[PDB]
Amino acid sequence: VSKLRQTTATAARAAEVMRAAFPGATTIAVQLPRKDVPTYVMANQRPQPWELLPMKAAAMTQYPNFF
Amino acid sequence: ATVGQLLGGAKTRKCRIRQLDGSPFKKGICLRVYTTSPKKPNSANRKLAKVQLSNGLKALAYIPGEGHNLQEHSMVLVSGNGVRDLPGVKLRIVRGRYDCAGVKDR
Amino acid sequence: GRFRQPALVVVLDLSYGGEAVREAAARNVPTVALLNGHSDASAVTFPVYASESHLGYHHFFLEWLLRVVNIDPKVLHTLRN
Amino acid sequence: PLPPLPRELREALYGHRWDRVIVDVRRTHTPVRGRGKREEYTAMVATGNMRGVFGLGIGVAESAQLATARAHLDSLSRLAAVPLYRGHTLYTHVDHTFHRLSIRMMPRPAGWGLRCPDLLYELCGLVGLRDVSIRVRGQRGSRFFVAQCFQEALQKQTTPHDGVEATGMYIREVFR
Amino acid sequence: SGERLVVRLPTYPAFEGYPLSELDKAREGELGALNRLVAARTAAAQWAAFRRDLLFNAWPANLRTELTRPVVVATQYPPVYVAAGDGAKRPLNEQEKVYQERRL
Amino acid sequence: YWQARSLLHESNLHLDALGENPRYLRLRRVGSLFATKLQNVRKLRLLLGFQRRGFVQKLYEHSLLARGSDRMWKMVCAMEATLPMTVTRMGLAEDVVGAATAIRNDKIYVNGKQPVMPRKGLLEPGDVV
RNA sequence: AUUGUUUGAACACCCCCCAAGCACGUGCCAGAAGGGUCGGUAAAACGUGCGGUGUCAGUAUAAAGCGUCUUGACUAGGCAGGCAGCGCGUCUGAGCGUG
RNA sequence: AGCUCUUGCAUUGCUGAAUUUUUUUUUUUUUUUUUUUUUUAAAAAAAAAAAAAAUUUUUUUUUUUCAAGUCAUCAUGGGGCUU
């Protein structure tokens, strides 16, 4: 049941990854340095690794083609 | 990752004996009581049993023990062990039940 | 002392002495060799970048080799002074 | 035939403790010009001292006692030394492949026990590994290759005591 | 003579680092120091537990639930008070503190 | 030096070499057999005389779940916390089996009147017998 | 607080895997087996007695699910070479994209 | 106890066949130099060099396989025999 309850724990931790990565850009919204739509990550049943899209966007915006 | 592999993974949970139909033991009426000669290097006449089973389908059954008493119209309990020495036959008649009881002085 | 077994084999021909470097590696003896460009010299411990092609290199190498082995340094100190 | 024994090995048999394990004995076959089918018994003997010096010996002969004795003395000729942590576990994770066999070896904290397959239990008790989880993958059908693979896989790892002199950087605090 | 000797829950070889003059500063490495200190701490704690277990040395229930005997009040240990039959508030009896400590 | 050997050095008391200067060939080397494990479990149960599986299995999981320092000074501590071994440490019987008969009478007086748990123990520190 | 002395009973197994071996019986017959298979007249597997190993008021058989199985591989297979590169190209899908 | 009774597919021994040719390439003696073991000494070991050479009237001698043959060579397992 802790799979269900521990979904949104990292969701509120992703928002300051947005704000301390991108001042002035706003469930979280992720602007990968590619086509103009910011790309959205949000809740489900199966819990998510929040800060893969924010963390990846900070990676690719600071250091393009990091991967 | 590679999205073909992402769609690349409920199949048929296959009963490895398809005649007991997932159950361990099914009874039935013996259609014919007959023996046969086996594959070489075996040549002893093994005694078998064709049974009209519980599930309405038919398969051959190994008859164990020092002789038996099974004739036409005779009910048995069929188990799940096979006899290897002839191909395609997967059934064992358990003894300790019905008209097929235990042998004398085992 | 006793027990005459080798301590350092120096090789002045890799081509006809490749097994000598290999056997010295198998005996855990360090080696000094001249590179020829044909044999597997992956077992040389101390490579010397010569190529067995010179009587002049042989005179130079053997001449310093003999002039350091034949005379003890205190004798050179007494000889210069 | 006669098997060899040296002089300076005779401070070691009077020295360390020693144990002996036959790995497997195998009968090979050859049809030969002239008289028929000549067989040899190939025997593989491991020998350690339970303090981190390990040995392997492969022997070939015509009869089983002579083959096992030859591999017995060949292992005791051929010894290699393996570093452990305080005589019970290995320093790093260890992965290796001899012929084409995927061994995977991990350290475990002491008192885990050996969670370990059949011959490798006597092998780890031989060299002195008390607390290691292993699994071997690939075609595991040969004892000889898991023995040789295990010797090389022990030889693969890295030691921390070759640094503190020359790295300027002191190496301590093992508290998890 | 007597002492406790405990080997630490014995760990992996470690990620393991400290600056260089701490070698001249510190005396004994932390496995021996943790052995001595953890020996002292576990000795004192298990002495307290041992003295308590040594100095230990109705159930009819069938309940139609009647409110006969007095009542005591993640659960916040130690218990708060004892509520009697007569509406009185009192602190814990000594025996009740004993069997509260046995209960845990 | 001679005494206090390694607690898992029981392969020096089974077969030895370089201390028998005779019979250079034909020396028996140990094969890959698990029967020494099964007979060692036999050495474990014969120290209780008890039915083979359930008791040593239950004590094995209790030995895992009690503390996690190691499995050698603590697994035999799980052996030693048992009551028949405890009576053998007191010395009220010739052996473990006679002590088991004495506790089968309930002549024993653990923690006041009787042990609440007769077959399993387990005597925690602080429990009188 | 009171006193006396003691280990049952079965089931399966006993060639290798897998701990455990012999007698008579019958000799590719009665038979057993999960696999390799053993019996083709001197059976360490089958008829029975003895003897022994496992579990024990349980034990074996049968099935079923997972693991072993990296045996659908993300951790973790690969694809001239066992089985696996589409005959080749155009190709704005999706995905990866600072010279 | 005795078989000349059986069984050469129960055997020991001995032999048949062609497997017809191979049986000389190898050491020893001596020299030089040197080092391994033992409380005044031999072997041993190692580098090199030189000579002696390998049995018999010239064939015997060394050789792989056939359930090859022989229980009447003796032997001997089993079975048979003893008005």
The per-residue DSSP string of C6-43 comes to: -S-EE-S-SSS-HHHHHHHHHTT--EEEE--SSS--TT
Angle at D88 between CA D82 and CA D94, to 5 degrees: 60
Token pair belonging to D53: 């010096």
Q: Please tell me the distance from the alpha carbon of residue F113 to that of residue E53, in angstroms, as a whole number.
A: 17
Q: How far is CA E70 from CA D30, E60, E80, E83, E104, in A?
A: 93, 16, 14, 6, 20
Q: By C-alpha distance, which of D130, B81, D137, E97 is closest to F72? A: D130
Q: Please tell me the distance from the alpha carbon of residue E101 to that of residue D119, in angstroms, as a whole number.
A: 51
Residues 6+ positions from B2 with CB-CB distance below 8 Å: none
* CB-based contact F108:F127 (threshold 8 Å): no
Q: How far is CA D25 from CA D48, D65, D78, D143, F16, in A?
A: 19, 10, 19, 9, 21
Other Cβ atoms closer than 10 A to D22: 23
* CB-based contact E102:E56 (threshold 8 Å): yes
Strand H–CB D35 distance below 7 A: yes
Q: Where are the beta strands (DSSP E) in D51-165?
A: 53-61, 79-81, 94-98, 101-107, 132-137
* CB-based contact B48:B90 (threshold 8 Å): no
Nearest nucleotide to D7 by CA–C1' distance? H36
Q: Please tell me the distance from the alpha carbon of residue D82 to that of residue D156, in angstroms, as a whole number.
A: 9
CA-based R_g, chain C, Å? 16
Strand H–CB C4 distance below 7 A: yes
Task: Return the C-alpha torsion angle D3, D4, D10, D15, nearest 10.
Answer: -60
Name every chain F residue with its beta carbon within 8 A of the beta carbon of E56.
126
Residue of E nearest to D161 (CA): E16
- Nucleic acid strand G: bases within 7 A of protein CB: 1, 5-8, 18-20, 28-40, 47-48, 53-57, 59, 61-66, 69-70, 72-74, 93-98
Is some CB atom of chain D closer than 8 A to the CB atom of E25? no
Residues 6+ positions from C40 with CB-CB distance below 8 Å: C18
Among protein residues, the one whose C-alpha sits closest to the C1' atom of G94 is B3
Q: How far is CA D162 from CA D165, D166, F71, in A?
A: 7, 8, 32
C1' of H46 to CA of C18 (Å): 25
Is some CB atom of chain E closer than 8 A to the CB atom of D111? yes
Residues 6+ positions from E57 with CB-CB distance below 8 Å: F111, F112, F126, F127, F128
Q: Please tell me the distance from the alpha carbon of residue D35 to that of residue F111, in angstroms, as a whole number.
A: 82
Nearest nucleotide to F97 by CA–C1' distance? G7
* CB-based contact F8:D114 (threshold 8 Å): no
Is some CB atom of chain F closer than 8 A to the CB atom of E53? yes
Residues 6+ positions from C80 with CB-CB distance below 8 Å: none
List, as one string, the DSSP characters of F13-63. Answer: TT---SS--S--SS---B-S-SHHHHHHHHHHHHTTT--HHHHHHHHHHHH
**Which method was used?**
cryo-EM
3-class DSSP string for B49-70: EEEEECCCCEEEEECCCCCCCC
B39 residue type, one letter? K
Is some CB atom of chain D closer than 8 A to the CB atom of F12? yes
Token pair belonging to C15: 């081509």
Chains F and E touch (3+ CB pairs under 8 A): yes
Residues linked to residue D45 through DSSP beta bridges, in sequence order: D22, D57
Token pair belonging to B97: 């039940």
- Contacts with E, F 31-90, CB within 8 Å: 68-70
Q: How many residues does chain A have?
A: 67
Strand G–CB F67 distance below 7 A: no
First to last CA, chain E: 34
Q: Please tell me the distance from the alpha carbon of residue C34 to that of residue C26, in angstroms, as a whole number.
A: 19
Q: Please tell me the distance from the alpha carbon of residue B89 to that of residue B82, in angstroms, as a whole number.
A: 6
Task: Return the C-alpha torsion angle E76, E81, E83, E88, nearest 10.
Answer: -150
Residues 6+ positions from C27 with CB-CB distance below 8 Å: C6
Across the interface, whether the CB atoms of E29 and D172 are under 8 A apart is answered: yes
Residue of E nearest to D85 (CA): E13
B41 residue type, one letter? P
CA-based R_g, chain A, Å? 13
Is some CB atom of chain E closer than 8 A to the CB atom of D171? yes
D10 residue type, one letter? R
List, as one string, the DSSP characters of chain E. Answer: -----------------B-TTHHHH--S-HHHHHHHHHHHHHHHHHHHHHHHHHTT------------S-EE----SSP--EE-TTS-EE---HHHHHHHHHH-
Is residue D151 exposed (0-12), middle (13-18) or buried (19+ Cβ within 10 Å)? buried
User: To which H or E segment does residue C79 belong?
Assistant: helix C73-80
User: To which H or E segment does residue B46 belong?
Assistant: strand B46-53
Query: Is the peptide bond preceding residue B77 cis, with omega within 30 degrees of 0?
Result: no
Residues linked to residue E83 through DSSP beta bridges, in sequence order: E71, E89
Q: How far is CA E103 from CA E91, E98, E100, in A?
A: 18, 9, 5
> Up-side HSE of residue F27: CA atoms within 13 Å toward CB?
23
Q: By C-alpha distance, which of F122, F112, F111, F103 is closest to F49? A: F103
C1' of G53 to CA of F117 (Å): 32
Sign of the dihedral defined by the CA atoms of residues D138, D141, D147, D148, in that order: negative
Token pair belonging to B51: 């049974």
C1' of H20 to CA of D164 (Å): 80
Across the interface, whether the CB atoms of F126 and E54 are under 8 A apart is answered: yes
Resolution, given in Å to one decimal, reads: 4.2
